[PDB]
Amino acid sequence: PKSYRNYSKTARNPKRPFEKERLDQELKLIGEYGLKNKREIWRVQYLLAKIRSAARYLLTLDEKSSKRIFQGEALLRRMVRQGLLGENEEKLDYVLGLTLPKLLERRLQTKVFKLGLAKSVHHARVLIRQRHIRVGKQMVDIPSFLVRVDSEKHIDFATTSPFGGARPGRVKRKSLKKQKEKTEA
Amino acid sequence: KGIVVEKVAIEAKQPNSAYRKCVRVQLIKNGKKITAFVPGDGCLNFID
Amino acid sequence: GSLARAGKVKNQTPKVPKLDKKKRLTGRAKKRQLYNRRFSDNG
Amino acid sequence: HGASRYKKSRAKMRWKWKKKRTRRLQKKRRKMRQRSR
RNA sequence: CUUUUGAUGUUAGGGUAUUGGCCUAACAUGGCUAUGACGGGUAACGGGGAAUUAGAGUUCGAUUCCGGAGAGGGAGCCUGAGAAAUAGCUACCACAUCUAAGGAAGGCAGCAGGCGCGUAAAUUACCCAAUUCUAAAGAAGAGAGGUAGUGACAAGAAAUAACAAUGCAAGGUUUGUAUUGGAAUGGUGGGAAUUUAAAACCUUCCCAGAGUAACAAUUGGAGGGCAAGUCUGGUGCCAGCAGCCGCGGUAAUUCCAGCUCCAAUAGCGUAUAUUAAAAUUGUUGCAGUUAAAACGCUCGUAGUUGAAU
RNA sequence: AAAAACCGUAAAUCCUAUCUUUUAAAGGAAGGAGAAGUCGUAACAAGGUUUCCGUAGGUGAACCUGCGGAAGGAUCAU
């Protein structure tokens, strides 16, 4: 009868809907990462709360306990692959301390803006939606794509992009100008 | 859902002074008489 | 017994149109301008 | 209502007389019930 | 409370597939109960689970799976390894179909669909291709099941632009900002590859195909709680708004409108119910002189708690 | 094979009784809300008789009075 595949929410409403400083901080983050909605930042901090809860539960467990010495490096290696923690990091206190902008730095639009390609973060957003960039052998049109610690070396333009060597420019303009040229000649 | 019986103006409380336009409704589910307020400026005219 | 004046102010309020204005810009662009309008000009 | 009857802080009818009037009404009601049944 | 009408037990038997007061005969007077029997209510099928959770908790669970029960309500029965079977039979009750009036025939709480009831819920579609079942077992069937249709129940991703030059503002020739003006790309239409039982969808490719990108985002607010107006007209304790406090009697920051602003955003209000908030049900963790609340007082059984070694 | 009888299973109908739920009703008697209504002045000051409790009787109403209490009293006091 009912389908057997699950589904879950990815965002949580903030409650206390009209905190002035919370609204200001949200607007700052929205503007300086160029993302369309505060639902997106709600998703990011929902994920952040998930990781943080796992980390603090692990910290409650005593050292060299089996659950900790399995899940702790599981989570730590996941964070390292995501690029959320550096090499100088080795413990769980740092994954407790990682923050919202540090999470937001890994979005596709922020990474492509940082690498160049697009001159504004909103330009990067629209370009990703315009499907002109490639994470390597695979094109992505999802701005919320989280780049891992190896793919940033090979984010670049998609091979089908006009900026990637495809169809040069406006075919309408080119055809019109060539018709004018052939008529004049 | 119910059937409109008639329309009535009800006094507001003492500190205020207004004639709230309500309607008397005969509920089709049971047959009970209830009083329902009609929101809006001229919405009483919108109901027969 | 004084239901005859229901909606008098609504009925007798003078009617004015919505004029023409400009299409309001929405989406990520809408957040763009209300983000960038609070630091540059002010000081 | 309970042990905090009287307590005239609000200028109400004296609780003793309210109780007496209620008892008179109850006597009348009991007499009517006995007459009916 | 149960106990003539089996209630509790013994003995013997009957019956059952088997044990058994399951039933029968005799006998005995037992069995349960304030640790709540026996009753009543449940808008009660139970569980796996769900919502909300700091931790405790509170509420929900008709509904994917498991178990139970039922096929309008009862009862009875045949076949069969297996049924007290219901798209099997028999009868009664209530409905209800055909009839030439003599008689026949029925059970959608299966899939669609209709009426009714309602605040409240989809197509009288396609197919056995997948899953699996039945058979005389490849080859046939299967409203099981799958596929599509309706579908803002929920859930996820995600458009409504981005960019270059002057004019203007701010700053020592840096940011924002009306003009131009070229790129980019979906939405859309058509063909195709593909997908598919067939078809559709997705994906991919090829043609056209955005300047007011008219390919035009809404919902609800702007006194406080609570983000955003002592802006402009109308009304004038009327109309109305307002969850609460309150606003409205000529200057209405609250009504009716326009402009602007705020909030969330393809979503946003409303109603009811529920959780947190609620340490306002308190085991964690409440309060009892005066806010509600120490029995008038003592004895006392059950209960709860009990010196050291 | 029809058919009949007897234990049993036992639908269904009717009578009676009880219980549950809903509901009509002359009359009676409350509560709440409303309006500038009528009569008085009960309480808050020693509220003009200190207030209040239990009980009993009486009165148009608030209320009054007797008995025994309390201070939440108007006295922490020769």
Curated annotation (Swiss-Prot), chain C:
BP terms from Gene Ontology: translation
GO molecular function: structural constituent of ribosome
Region Disordered, residue ranges: 1-43
Highest taxon of source: Eukaryota
Keywords assigned: Cytoplasm, Ribonucleoprotein, Ribosomal protein
Biased composition (Basic residues): 20-35
Purpose of the protein: Component of the ribosome, a large ribonucleoprotein complex responsible for the synthesis of proteins in the cell. The small ribosomal subunit (SSU) binds messenger RNAs (mRNAs) and translates the encoded message by selecting cognate aminoacyl-transfer RNA (tRNA) molecules. The large subunit (LSU) contains the ribosomal catalytic site termed the peptidyl transferase center (PTC), which catalyzes the formation of peptide bonds, thereby polymerizing the amino acids delivered by tRNAs into a polypeptide chain.
Assembly with partners or alone: Component of the small ribosomal subunit. Mature ribosomes consist of a small (40S) and a large (60S) subunit. The 40S subunit contains about 32 different proteins and 1 molecule of RNA (18S). The 60S subunit contains about 42 different proteins and 3 molecules of RNA (28S, 5.8S and 5S).
The protein, known as: Small ribosomal subunit protein eS30
Phylogenetic classification of the source organism: Eukaryota, Sar, Alveolata, Apicomplexa, Aconoidasida
Full-sequence portion shown in this chain: 6 to 48 of 58
